[PDB]
């Protein structure tokens, strides 16, 4: 076990029965890959948190700084991508995760890795490949061959790492299903929710400027939350409610003037959810509480990233 | 003879003639072609090898890529099986009299540097472009594979890796070749050979279609295939027998004929043979019989070299 702790705040495990089997082993391993990102935001942190969960549960953690994939996803030049990966590694360690950090290009260009990419290319239809990239592929009016190489590259990555568990965001689930159908060793997949962007108009993303970075200043965090989409009574699609759900600790103390109800103690996110859905808790008061608790959560991350000056 | 005209003869397309002249000014110059290994080597293969000998006769160092990785990506089986067919293809090409550098594509196409550049070209090649370039090359498939769109860029980078001045192939290769001219910094001169018509007259000739004459077909099989072949009187376009006459027969040619039907005709040019056949002067039956016996004699030293171990 540790099963329930691992399942907490994930969208799906494929499959739970297979995960319980993995959890019986003395030795188990789990991996995730991150295309390097110039800013590291709460979407990354949610995933790192889950890797820390797995680590707490006796999993050896592997982190792929997926520079080759970022390159195939048109994020730029390989050496420039790798340097952002270097910075991403420091952020992940500052979040509390000690793990094995590999750059994808350390093994994803070996001849026998490459031969298996082409073997997998013989078994992956263009349709399957294109459909697995719909939520991942950079936007492009003239889609590139690189886009359908990207998923078979990610599948072969998992093949060569040989872990028991693969972790990723829900946008990754079609690539994960492709690896389960194509590979001899079937990996247990754990998928994290994809956070909603701050203006509520889509999914949070490094390229859309609609995120909170883990090293944003408290003042920037307060401004981003203040201006955030947060309809009273509306929980689904609400970025503020999501932050409250996936990062904050409970009981939660929501401070208010006496004229609007005075201070409030919420013992659970579910309790928080009905209060807000009922319109008992106003969006301004929710924002203030989420902002101040989130600043404290991100405080020691930001400090370690800045304490060199 | 003039090197340019010797290279140009019986080709369908040069990209471009002006770049071909500038390459022929150089003392050191190379040409290359790839072949997916094929269980039977046929007249379409022969025509291309004859063009490589032309180029070699004009001072080009020849490279022949036995294209095993590409054949692998194009669903021709496993590499060891493919490579073994490649070994056989190499003997046939030599039995055709082509001394050249023979390479297996896999020898260099899985290198780390090579692979990175494949991925780089994949960023610059659209899916629609890649698929268009493969329309005459891809193995038929109800559910097309990613392998199909990797194939063109594998071929493109292969030429980039070979450093050749000239790239030779059939007309089915011309989209891949124009893609290579767009994407690479050295623009390669492309010499395209015609694709022969099938022996039944319908559609192009193809290993997969079994509508060809193999260079090691027995005389009786050759005569039989030719006797069967589509050959309307006075119909030159799409006439596989007239194609063979034009691309493989040697002139002046002596069409044997009964005296009762005119006697031996000595045609010293394909063009007149065309004009003769055009005006229905020269009958199909008489054309088939001359083409079959000439071709048998053309192909005889090759079949002999290949059957010599027996
Ligand atoms: C530019 Si090259 C010498 C790496 C090259 C050329 C042609 C081929 C094979 C051809 N497409 C076929 O179907 O036989 C392979 C490689």
Residue numbers in the entry:
A (entry chain A): 2 to 310
B (entry chain B): 1 to 310
From the paper:
To make the 1D 1H-NMR method broadly applicable for the investigation of dynamic conformation change in both small proteins and large membrane protein complexes, we report the highly efficient and selective incorporation of TMSiPhe in proteins in Escherichia coli cells. The Key to the success of this method was the identification of a mutant Methanococcus jannaschii tyrosyl-tRNA synthetase (TyrRS) that exhibits high specificity toward 4-trimethylsilyl phenylalanine (TMSiPhe) in E. coli cells. The application of the genetic coding of TMSiPhe and its combination with the 1D 1H-NMR spectrometry for detection of conformational change in a biological system was named as DeSipher method, and is used for specific incorporation of Si into the desired protein. In particular, the low electronegativity of Si led to a uniquely low 1H chemical shift for CH3-Si (typically <0.55 ppm), which could be easily identified from the complicated 1H spectra of macro-biomolecules.
To investigate the molecular basis of the selective recognition of TMSiPhe by TMSiPheRS, we crystallized TMSiPheRS and analyzed the structures by X-ray crystallography. The crystal structures of TMSiPheRS alone and the complex of TMSiPheRS with TMSiPhe were determined at 1.8 Å and 2.1 Å, respectively. The 2Fo-Fc annealing omit map of the TMSiPheRS/TMSiPhe complex unambiguously assigned the electron density for TMSiPhe. Introduction of the TMS group significantly increased the volume of the amino-acid substrate by ~60%. To compensate for this substantial change in volume, three residues, namely, D158, I159, and V164, were replaced by the smallest amino-acid glycine, and Y32 and L65 were substituted by the relatively small residues H32 and V65, respectively. We then compared the crystal structure of the TMSiPheRS/TMSiPhe complex with that of apo TMSiPheRS. Compared with the structure of TMSiPheRS alone, we observed a dramatic 120-degree rotation of histidine 32 in response to TMSiPhe binding. Moreover, Leu162 rotated ~42 degrees to form hydrophobic interactions with the methyl groups of TMSiPhe. Altogether, G34, V65, Q70, F108, Q109, Y151, Q155, G158, G159, Q173, and H177 defined a hydrophobic pocket for the accommodation of and specific interactions with the phenyl ring and TMS group of TMSiPhe. These observations provided a structural basis for specific and efficient incorporation of TMSiPhe using evolved TMSiPheRS.
